[PDB]
Amino acid sequence: ELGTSNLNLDARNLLAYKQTEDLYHQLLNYPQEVISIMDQTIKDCMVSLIVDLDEIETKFYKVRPYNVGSCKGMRELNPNDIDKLINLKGLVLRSTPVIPDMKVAFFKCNVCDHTMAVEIDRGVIQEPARCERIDCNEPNSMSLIHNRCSFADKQVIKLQETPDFVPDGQTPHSISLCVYDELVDSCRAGDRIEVTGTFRSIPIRANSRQRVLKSLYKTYVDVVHVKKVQDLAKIREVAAREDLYSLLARSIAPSIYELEDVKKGILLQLFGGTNKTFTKGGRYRGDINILLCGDPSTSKSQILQYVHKITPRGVYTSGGLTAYITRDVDTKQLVLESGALVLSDGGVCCIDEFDKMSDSTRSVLHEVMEQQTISIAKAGIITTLNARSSILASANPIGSRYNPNLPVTENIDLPPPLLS
Amino acid sequence: LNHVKKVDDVTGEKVREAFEQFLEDFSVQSTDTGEVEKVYRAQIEFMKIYDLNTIYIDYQHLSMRENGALAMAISEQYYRFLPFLQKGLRRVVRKYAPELLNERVFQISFFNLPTVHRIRDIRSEKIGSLLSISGTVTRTSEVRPELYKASFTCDMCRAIVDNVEQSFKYTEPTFCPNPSCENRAFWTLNVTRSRFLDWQKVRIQENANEIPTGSMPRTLDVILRGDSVERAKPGDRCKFTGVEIVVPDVTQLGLPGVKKTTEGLNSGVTGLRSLGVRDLTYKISFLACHVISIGDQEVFLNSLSSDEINELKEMVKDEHIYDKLVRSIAPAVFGHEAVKKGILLQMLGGVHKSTVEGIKLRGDINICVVGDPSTSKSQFLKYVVGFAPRSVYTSGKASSAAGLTAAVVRDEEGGDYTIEAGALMLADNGICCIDEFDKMDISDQVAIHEAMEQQTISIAKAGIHATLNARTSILAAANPVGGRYNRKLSLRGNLNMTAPIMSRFDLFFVILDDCNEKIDTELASHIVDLHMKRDEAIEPPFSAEQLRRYIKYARTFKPILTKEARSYLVEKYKELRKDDAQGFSRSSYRITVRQLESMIRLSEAIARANCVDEITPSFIAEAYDLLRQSIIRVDV
DNA sequence: AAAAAAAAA
Ligand SMILES: Nc1ncnc2c1ncn2[C@@H]1O[C@H](COP(=O)(O)OP(=O)(O)O)[C@@H](O)[C@H]1O
Ligand SMILES: Nc1ncnc2c1ncn2[C@@H]1O[C@H](COP(=O)(O)OP(=O)(O)O)[C@@H](O)[C@H]1O
Ligand SMILES: [Zn+2]
Ligand SMILES: [Zn+2]
């Protein structure tokens, strides 16, 4: 009734049956053949159960087995476990662009403009030495066409072990990963995932000019499974409560004692104002910016962390924050990277230790609040970027205490206009 | 020998037939008066009368022709059916305009696609299919010629073999038609017989909008060809329309020349004749055919239209243009009439003249605005940035090393030795809007008064010397020392700027705030009304488009001076020099020849505003009044 | 990888 093509399959339920545990063990030994015959069986089972036959002949069927065995780490991988199913947990380090993979060749007899399709296997292609048309039958008239073939999307993922496997301050190890089709782009940088797949080994070409091969084989894992690590009616019931303001203000900071007014202000600025861009006058700022000052005995960083994690979008930084052209590390190319302030579009940008802000970056803030659009002109790139972000900062007075007699300006050491 | 007839791809012939059919007889109607347009026939007429080579086809106009039996058939297998479309286009053109062929590379660009894809959604199943993508261009390359159709000479018999189609490698022929010869030797390329085409490679990446979290942006390589070169400048967000292709590694392929990444595991393919024992890899690249971006008075009169004639004639023939004109500048702000008039005069500008021996005369107006905090001084800056073309907004303290004028940057042990352009350099032929003038530093503080008067910037550092053009019209704002303007003192006493900088400016405006109960209520009411009630319903006498039309019409006039104008001007200059020098010695020095030149420039600008080729001494009197009230203010 | 010269903070 859905039209999709996807099956989930747990091993423990597969293990609960006495005949199936034999199939369990045989799946452990021979993954590829078992998976292929299982997919063929499901392809037959669809038709066996529907007894529209038109949507079936277009789609394929695949399984996604999981929980076959306990998760193993890169620190214990014997060569005895080659071509067997294992489960891994780890953190994604880096991804790669989609790699086209040859599946069907397309040749053409240039003399007679005749084309034929040739299948391949194991990557190696058996080139035909003569055109099939015996009317011409020339041997050297066959030429490959690159852009009229069929391809598959291969992608390589780099994975690192979880830090819990290193008890004595050793360094983590990295294992390469491979994915196909629906598994492409399913993980990004910093993602914590668990995968299920078979093990593999491959020879190294060494010198590309000759046919010499190294005595050591590189190891990589091919996977078939990944996992990560009407409510509006309830809103209006709460929205009709008279004292919702006080409860909502006090809910943000459960451990903070008193300080009710600042909590109300922070909640209200989290709510945010309106934004309008009428043509004849120009846009008006809708962001709210708040500054906190006091001696370092107020737990004012706890409120910063509270607002950072509560808000949908927001970056928590300290005293670089904007876009700058960078030289890519692993690949020798030039990439434009956006800063922390740009990343907080529509959210709350949290700044800690605002006094030690240097001098070059402060003017940047003087540019980002009054116009909410930062421009850059470096390396031949001239452009303007939108920020539209809210600022919430904390500052400390100069000295062990803030003397009430002295006015605020001297103690914080900030420019009068920026405070204004 | 056998001469076997080639296979006829009838599908290509059928799609070509349908293509030429809806090319010849589209026959769409645009408006009521446009009964039959024949838009593509008119396009061919345009190529006749202007010698053009590219044609533009709308996808929507193609969409309703034969439904998906033709539109989808072309879009999906675009590479498959491209030569058939080329043949059909050549057939119809040589049916309707043989002399246009004088044999030439016709190009077709499809536009207005239903949807656009993100870079992260690019997948291999769409190879050879028409597509549209968007991103930020970050780098381009030089416009290099590209071999398209090569002609070859068989050296031992000097026979001619031509029309050899090329591929991703430089290909020589494989046979010689001469019966006595058998092409044992290779060929010599005939450069003067081959035909080349333009080629430029650009790089694009995902916008900051699409990219999630802190991951790195995805990059792609786009190749342009034909008339679409230099159309995507770095830093611009653009939309590309073209066909997905794939490029192999030519290094493994046979060539006359000599031959993250270390982990390998690439999809290598081996087993061919020419590869030997080498493996072939591939990479995704995009081919583009259409690029668009989403981010003399007689010449002006040539752009003729009913509104162009009527509106401009009405504006010229009116009697109270000036009275209305100043009322139409920055309708959002409240009050400050003279600041509006001054900004209008700055935006008109003055005539630029050069002497007979090569001495340049400054032809621009510089204006400074001084006032106590919060009296709506940055609003004028923002409005003039948003209205005046080629304008740049800049803060007084610049975070970059370029600062205001320029700077020299070199790579560590790198042979760059290149300059970077400051805001003044970018603002060429435009208006530079610096804010918070007070806290400039010494280098900029001494470079500005050379950039202003002489309109050039000169530098000589670390083996590179240059003289950059900085023809700009500056407008600046500042705040008095101590926060509030002290009426007791003068401009020099309150401001911290140096005396030479003050002489550079041509006009000054001082605006103050007060605690009067009658003014602040009106100010608050006007702010509230624009905020909620009439956020779009302001009442300016003239619209922005009319303002721009009149400004561009008035900019095409160069006023002159008459005898009475010269006599009145010299009398006024003598009076202004005399009366100020009567005050005190060694304490008042503010009038130089620059003031006379400023009078001339302001009179020329006022004459331009009224669209008069001559100058009346009333304009001189008005300019003198402005410059004198610039000194009335410093007294009060 | 390590020494030495130049512009900007
Ligand atoms: N009212 C309070 N309630 C709970 N904890 C507090 C309170 N005041 C101070 N603290 C404790 O004292 C510390 C104050 O540190 P803080 O001033 O936030 O450092 P910073 O210099 O980063 O602002 C907090 O870590 C908090 O645990
Ligand atoms: N129509 C108006 N009349 C008077 N003041 C205005 C008007 N519109 C905006 N303003 C105020 O003028 C200020 C413009 O900033 P600016 O004049 O540079 O003062 P500051 O130097 O303190 O930023 C804005 O903060 C705004 O509140
Ligand atoms: Zn053949
Ligand atoms: Zn020959």
PDB file of C-alpha atoms in Angstrom, chain A residues 44-203:
ATOM      1  CA  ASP A  44       8.593 -13.732  -5.542  1.00  0.00           C
ATOM      2  CA  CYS A  45       6.709 -13.231  -2.259  1.00  0.00           C
ATOM      3  CA  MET A  46       5.196  -9.920  -3.360  1.00  0.00           C
ATOM      4  CA  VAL A  47       3.479 -11.611  -6.313  1.00  0.00           C
ATOM      5  CA  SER A  48       2.650 -14.669  -4.198  1.00  0.00           C
ATOM      6  CA  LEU A  49       0.857 -12.391  -1.715  1.00  0.00           C
ATOM      7  CA  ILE A  50      -0.978 -10.128  -4.188  1.00  0.00           C
ATOM      8  CA  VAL A  51      -2.750 -13.254  -5.454  1.00  0.00           C
ATOM      9  CA  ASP A  52      -0.867  -4.814  -9.554  1.00  0.00           C
ATOM     10  CA  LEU A  53       2.099  -6.591 -11.207  1.00  0.00           C
ATOM     11  CA  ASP A  54       3.024  -3.270 -12.882  1.00  0.00           C
ATOM     12  CA  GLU A  55       4.740  -1.456  -9.996  1.00  0.00           C
ATOM     13  CA  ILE A  56       6.632  -4.630  -9.046  1.00  0.00           C
ATOM     14  CA  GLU A  57       8.512  -5.147 -12.328  1.00  0.00           C
ATOM     15  CA  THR A  58      10.090  -1.687 -11.934  1.00  0.00           C
ATOM     16  CA  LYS A  59      11.220  -1.899  -8.297  1.00  0.00           C
ATOM     17  CA  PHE A  60      13.823  -4.154  -6.713  1.00  0.00           C
ATOM     18  CA  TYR A  61      13.935  -5.500  -3.162  1.00  0.00           C
ATOM     19  CA  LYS A  62      16.666  -5.395  -0.528  1.00  0.00           C
ATOM     20  CA  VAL A  63      17.052  -6.371   3.116  1.00  0.00           C
ATOM     21  CA  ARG A  64      18.762  -4.516   5.957  1.00  0.00           C
ATOM     22  CA  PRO A  65      19.788  -7.120   8.553  1.00  0.00           C
ATOM     23  CA  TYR A  66      21.094  -5.876  11.881  1.00  0.00           C
ATOM     24  CA  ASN A  67      22.079  -6.920  15.409  1.00  0.00           C
ATOM     25  CA  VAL A  68      23.898  -9.981  14.074  1.00  0.00           C
ATOM     26  CA  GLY A  69      26.621  -9.817  16.727  1.00  0.00           C
ATOM     27  CA  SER A  70      28.161  -7.639  19.400  1.00  0.00           C
ATOM     28  CA  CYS A  71      29.907  -4.450  18.329  1.00  0.00           C
ATOM     29  CA  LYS A  72      33.629  -4.951  17.733  1.00  0.00           C
ATOM     30  CA  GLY A  73      36.332  -2.292  17.664  1.00  0.00           C
ATOM     31  CA  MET A  74      39.288  -1.569  15.420  1.00  0.00           C
ATOM     32  CA  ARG A  75      41.630  -2.638  18.239  1.00  0.00           C
ATOM     33  CA  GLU A  76      40.543  -6.306  17.897  1.00  0.00           C
ATOM     34  CA  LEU A  77      40.113  -7.371  14.251  1.00  0.00           C
ATOM     35  CA  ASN A  78      41.866 -10.651  13.513  1.00  0.00           C
ATOM     36  CA  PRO A  79      42.315 -11.874   9.920  1.00  0.00           C
ATOM     37  CA  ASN A  80      40.138 -14.851  10.924  1.00  0.00           C
ATOM     38  CA  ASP A  81      37.061 -12.596  10.557  1.00  0.00           C
ATOM     39  CA  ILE A  82      37.445 -11.875   6.834  1.00  0.00           C
ATOM     40  CA  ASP A  83      34.189 -12.098   4.846  1.00  0.00           C
ATOM     41  CA  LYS A  84      32.004 -12.230   7.964  1.00  0.00           C
ATOM     42  CA  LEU A  85      29.301  -9.958   9.348  1.00  0.00           C
ATOM     43  CA  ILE A  86      30.249  -7.640  12.219  1.00  0.00           C
ATOM     44  CA  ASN A  87      28.684  -4.562  13.809  1.00  0.00           C
ATOM     45  CA  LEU A  88      30.558  -1.304  14.400  1.00  0.00           C
ATOM     46  CA  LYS A  89      29.848   1.903  16.299  1.00  0.00           C
ATOM     47  CA  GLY A  90      31.831   5.029  15.525  1.00  0.00           C
ATOM     48  CA  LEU A  91      31.941   8.711  14.655  1.00  0.00           C
ATOM     49  CA  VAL A  92      32.003   9.903  11.049  1.00  0.00           C
ATOM     50  CA  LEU A  93      35.138  11.916  10.291  1.00  0.00           C
ATOM     51  CA  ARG A  94      34.790  12.823   6.609  1.00  0.00           C
ATOM     52  CA  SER A  95      32.689  11.977   3.561  1.00  0.00           C
ATOM     53  CA  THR A  96      33.485  11.938  -0.155  1.00  0.00           C
ATOM     54  CA  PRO A  97      31.578  12.998  -3.279  1.00  0.00           C
ATOM     55  CA  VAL A  98      29.641  10.363  -5.183  1.00  0.00           C
ATOM     56  CA  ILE A  99      31.921   8.151  -7.286  1.00  0.00           C
ATOM     57  CA  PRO A 100      30.391   6.870 -10.555  1.00  0.00           C
ATOM     58  CA  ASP A 101      30.746   3.105 -10.923  1.00  0.00           C
ATOM     59  CA  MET A 102      30.785   1.283 -14.251  1.00  0.00           C
ATOM     60  CA  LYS A 103      27.949  -1.194 -14.767  1.00  0.00           C
ATOM     61  CA  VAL A 104      27.113  -1.266 -18.504  1.00  0.00           C
ATOM     62  CA  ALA A 105      29.450  -0.400 -21.372  1.00  0.00           C
ATOM     63  CA  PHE A 106      28.333   1.329 -24.573  1.00  0.00           C
ATOM     64  CA  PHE A 107      30.397   0.710 -27.712  1.00  0.00           C
ATOM     65  CA  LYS A 108      30.015   1.972 -31.268  1.00  0.00           C
ATOM     66  CA  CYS A 109      31.404   0.788 -34.607  1.00  0.00           C
ATOM     67  CA  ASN A 110      32.527   4.190 -35.873  1.00  0.00           C
ATOM     68  CA  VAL A 111      32.791   3.016 -39.492  1.00  0.00           C
ATOM     69  CA  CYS A 112      29.179   1.804 -39.698  1.00  0.00           C
ATOM     70  CA  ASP A 113      27.761   3.761 -36.708  1.00  0.00           C
ATOM     71  CA  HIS A 114      26.448   0.587 -35.062  1.00  0.00           C
ATOM     72  CA  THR A 115      26.120   0.325 -31.283  1.00  0.00           C
ATOM     73  CA  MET A 116      26.027  -2.606 -28.870  1.00  0.00           C
ATOM     74  CA  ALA A 117      25.677  -2.936 -25.099  1.00  0.00           C
ATOM     75  CA  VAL A 118      28.180  -5.046 -23.146  1.00  0.00           C
ATOM     76  CA  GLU A 119      27.834  -6.167 -19.538  1.00  0.00           C
ATOM     77  CA  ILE A 120      30.814  -6.241 -17.177  1.00  0.00           C
ATOM     78  CA  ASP A 121      31.788  -8.264 -14.117  1.00  0.00           C
ATOM     79  CA  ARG A 122      34.241  -7.657 -11.253  1.00  0.00           C
ATOM     80  CA  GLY A 123      35.097  -4.301 -12.828  1.00  0.00           C
ATOM     81  CA  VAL A 124      37.112  -6.001 -15.561  1.00  0.00           C
ATOM     82  CA  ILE A 125      35.553  -5.539 -19.006  1.00  0.00           C
ATOM     83  CA  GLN A 126      36.128  -7.979 -21.869  1.00  0.00           C
ATOM     84  CA  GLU A 127      36.419  -5.722 -24.901  1.00  0.00           C
ATOM     85  CA  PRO A 128      35.049  -7.194 -28.161  1.00  0.00           C
ATOM     86  CA  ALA A 129      37.782  -7.434 -30.791  1.00  0.00           C
ATOM     87  CA  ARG A 130      35.406  -7.106 -33.761  1.00  0.00           C
ATOM     88  CA  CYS A 131      31.999  -5.639 -34.519  1.00  0.00           C
ATOM     89  CA  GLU A 132      29.171  -8.173 -34.575  1.00  0.00           C
ATOM     90  CA  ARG A 133      28.033  -6.946 -38.014  1.00  0.00           C
ATOM     91  CA  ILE A 134      29.655  -9.415 -40.411  1.00  0.00           C
ATOM     92  CA  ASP A 135      28.703  -7.111 -43.296  1.00  0.00           C
ATOM     93  CA  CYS A 136      31.613  -4.855 -42.288  1.00  0.00           C
ATOM     94  CA  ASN A 137      33.358  -7.042 -39.671  1.00  0.00           C
ATOM     95  CA  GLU A 138      36.177  -4.643 -39.031  1.00  0.00           C
ATOM     96  CA  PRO A 139      38.346  -5.283 -35.945  1.00  0.00           C
ATOM     97  CA  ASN A 140      39.582  -1.772 -35.122  1.00  0.00           C
ATOM     98  CA  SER A 141      36.346   0.160 -35.761  1.00  0.00           C
ATOM     99  CA  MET A 142      35.019  -0.299 -32.205  1.00  0.00           C
ATOM    100  CA  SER A 143      35.170   2.788 -29.971  1.00  0.00           C
ATOM    101  CA  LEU A 144      33.821   3.354 -26.465  1.00  0.00           C
ATOM    102  CA  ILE A 145      31.347   6.136 -25.663  1.00  0.00           C
ATOM    103  CA  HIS A 146      31.875   7.481 -22.151  1.00  0.00           C
ATOM    104  CA  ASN A 147      28.707   9.526 -21.637  1.00  0.00           C
ATOM    105  CA  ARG A 148      26.095   7.070 -22.979  1.00  0.00           C
ATOM    106  CA  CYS A 149      26.693   4.309 -20.409  1.00  0.00           C
ATOM    107  CA  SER A 150      25.035   3.442 -17.084  1.00  0.00           C
ATOM    108  CA  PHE A 151      26.587   4.104 -13.684  1.00  0.00           C
ATOM    109  CA  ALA A 152      26.086   3.527  -9.967  1.00  0.00           C
ATOM    110  CA  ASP A 153      26.813   5.946  -7.122  1.00  0.00           C
ATOM    111  CA  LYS A 154      29.587   4.712  -4.831  1.00  0.00           C
ATOM    112  CA  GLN A 155      30.631   6.703  -1.772  1.00  0.00           C
ATOM    113  CA  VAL A 156      33.439   6.200   0.755  1.00  0.00           C
ATOM    114  CA  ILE A 157      32.969   7.138   4.421  1.00  0.00           C
ATOM    115  CA  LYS A 158      35.789   7.518   6.946  1.00  0.00           C
ATOM    116  CA  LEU A 159      34.972   6.262  10.443  1.00  0.00           C
ATOM    117  CA  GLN A 160      36.756   6.582  13.784  1.00  0.00           C
ATOM    118  CA  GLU A 161      36.348   4.440  16.881  1.00  0.00           C
ATOM    119  CA  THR A 162      34.362   5.737  19.827  1.00  0.00           C
ATOM    120  CA  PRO A 163      36.563   7.261  22.569  1.00  0.00           C
ATOM    121  CA  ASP A 164      35.272   4.751  25.144  1.00  0.00           C
ATOM    122  CA  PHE A 165      37.559   2.018  23.753  1.00  0.00           C
ATOM    123  CA  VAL A 166      40.749   3.918  24.679  1.00  0.00           C
ATOM    124  CA  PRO A 167      41.344   3.790  28.454  1.00  0.00           C
ATOM    125  CA  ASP A 168      45.042   4.718  28.659  1.00  0.00           C
ATOM    126  CA  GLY A 169      45.330   7.825  26.489  1.00  0.00           C
ATOM    127  CA  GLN A 170      46.150   6.044  23.234  1.00  0.00           C
ATOM    128  CA  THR A 171      45.152   7.347  19.831  1.00  0.00           C
ATOM    129  CA  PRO A 172      41.997   6.303  17.953  1.00  0.00           C
ATOM    130  CA  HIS A 173      42.143   4.371  14.691  1.00  0.00           C
ATOM    131  CA  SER A 174      40.268   4.948  11.433  1.00  0.00           C
ATOM    132  CA  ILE A 175      38.478   2.352   9.290  1.00  0.00           C
ATOM    133  CA  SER A 176      37.229   3.048   5.771  1.00  0.00           C
ATOM    134  CA  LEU A 177      33.594   2.432   4.835  1.00  0.00           C
ATOM    135  CA  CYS A 178      31.663   1.886   1.609  1.00  0.00           C
ATOM    136  CA  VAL A 179      27.996   2.553   0.805  1.00  0.00           C
ATOM    137  CA  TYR A 180      25.667   2.123  -2.169  1.00  0.00           C
ATOM    138  CA  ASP A 181      22.520   3.821  -3.479  1.00  0.00           C
ATOM    139  CA  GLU A 182      20.122   4.680  -0.649  1.00  0.00           C
ATOM    140  CA  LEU A 183      23.020   4.770   1.831  1.00  0.00           C
ATOM    141  CA  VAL A 184      24.622   7.746   0.048  1.00  0.00           C
ATOM    142  CA  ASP A 185      24.778  10.952   2.124  1.00  0.00           C
ATOM    143  CA  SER A 186      22.962   9.239   5.008  1.00  0.00           C
ATOM    144  CA  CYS A 187      25.715  10.418   7.382  1.00  0.00           C
ATOM    145  CA  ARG A 188      27.585  13.705   7.785  1.00  0.00           C
ATOM    146  CA  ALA A 189      30.561  14.969   9.768  1.00  0.00           C
ATOM    147  CA  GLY A 190      30.393  14.445  13.521  1.00  0.00           C
ATOM    148  CA  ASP A 191      27.562  11.908  13.313  1.00  0.00           C
ATOM    149  CA  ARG A 192      27.529   8.996  15.760  1.00  0.00           C
ATOM    150  CA  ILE A 193      26.287   5.879  13.966  1.00  0.00           C
ATOM    151  CA  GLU A 194      26.201   2.097  14.199  1.00  0.00           C
ATOM    152  CA  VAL A 195      26.614  -0.035  11.081  1.00  0.00           C
ATOM    153  CA  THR A 196      26.229  -3.678  10.062  1.00  0.00           C
ATOM    154  CA  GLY A 197      28.231  -5.143   7.203  1.00  0.00           C
ATOM    155  CA  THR A 198      30.798  -7.642   6.007  1.00  0.00           C
ATOM    156  CA  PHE A 199      34.592  -7.415   6.053  1.00  0.00           C
ATOM    157  CA  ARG A 200      36.862  -7.219   3.022  1.00  0.00           C
ATOM    158  CA  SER A 201      40.486  -7.089   1.884  1.00  0.00           C
ATOM    159  CA  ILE A 202      42.028  -5.755  -1.320  1.00  0.00           C
ATOM    160  CA  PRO A 203      45.535  -5.705  -2.859  1.00  0.00           C
TER     161      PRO A 203
END
